[PDB]
């Protein structure tokens, strides 16, 4: 199976698999059952921002999800990615709906990763920023129901002609270039990701969430990973 590390913005409480009884953010290490969560006061129809950071000094994955003029939700988990992920990975956003649904619109996405060698103390770096998404955006690998074009946005899951989000949808966007996320010969390794998102549910019954994830390079949507599986995991283990 794929190897997945993710920060989930989980809008739908799946209590039978360990979600708390509220929308939450979580750190997922190789399981949809988050190693750490924090309550998140999701605001239907409002643009939010998620920021994810990790560095190899502290080896601590943290995320903050906020809306303008509201208290943020923050979650952090100590994890040595050297021991979890392969050296080379792809990074992406994923989202899903199930019986219930929501738009999973990404308005912008930025990422920076840096690796400083122990041998030379010089740094390799990758940065991309998308503040608009184009039709046929060739530096993104779109998977499942993900599309770009409309409003200059990235719609991770399916939205109908009238703007209604559809259920049982899953889709992901991965940056095209593999990222050298860790290396033993590195003094400091670090990455940050930021994306802005618009989650909208008419019936005020949102599901299932958005995730930033890091994966093996050839990662694909696990078959059937709609709903609570967030397009990330083949099961709920």
């Amino acid at each position: 199976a794929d190897t997945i590390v993710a920060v989930e913005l989980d809008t739908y409480p799946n209590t039978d698999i360990g979600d708390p009884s509220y929308p939450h953010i979580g750190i997922d290490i190789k399981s949809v059952r988050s190693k750490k969560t924090a309550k998140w006061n999701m605001q239907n129809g409002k643009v939010g921002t998620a920021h994810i950071i990790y560095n190899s000094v502290d080896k601590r994955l943290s995320a903050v999800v906020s809306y303008p003029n509201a208290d943020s939700a923050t979650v952090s988990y100590d994890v040595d990615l050297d021991n979890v992920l392969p050296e080379w990975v792809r990074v992406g956003l994923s989202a899903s709906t199930g019986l219930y649904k929501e738009t999973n619109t990404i308005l912008s996405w930025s990422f920076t990763s840096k690796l400083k060698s122990n041998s030379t103390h010089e740094t390799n770096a990758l940065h991309f920023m998308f503040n608009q998404f184009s039709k046929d955006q060739k530096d993104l690998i779109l998977q499942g129901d993900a599309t770009t074009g409309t409003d200059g946005n990235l719609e991770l899951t399916r939205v109908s002609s009238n703007g209604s989000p559809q259920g049982s949808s899953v889709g992901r966007a991965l940056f095209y270039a593999p990222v050298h996320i860790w290396e033993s010969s590195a003094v400091v390794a670090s990455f940050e990701a930021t994306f802005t998102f618009l989650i909208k549910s008419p019936d005020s019954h949102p599901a299932d969430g958005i995730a930033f994830f890091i994966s093996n390079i050839d990662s694909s949507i696990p078959s059937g990973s709609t709903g609570r599986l967030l397009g990330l995991f083949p099961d709920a283990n």
């Binding site: 739908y12 409480p13 799946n14 209590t15 019986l99 219930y100 019936d203 019954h205």
Partner: peptide
């Protein structure tokens, strides 16, 4: 069926 959490909403339900």
């Amino acid at each position: 069926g959490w909403y339900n």
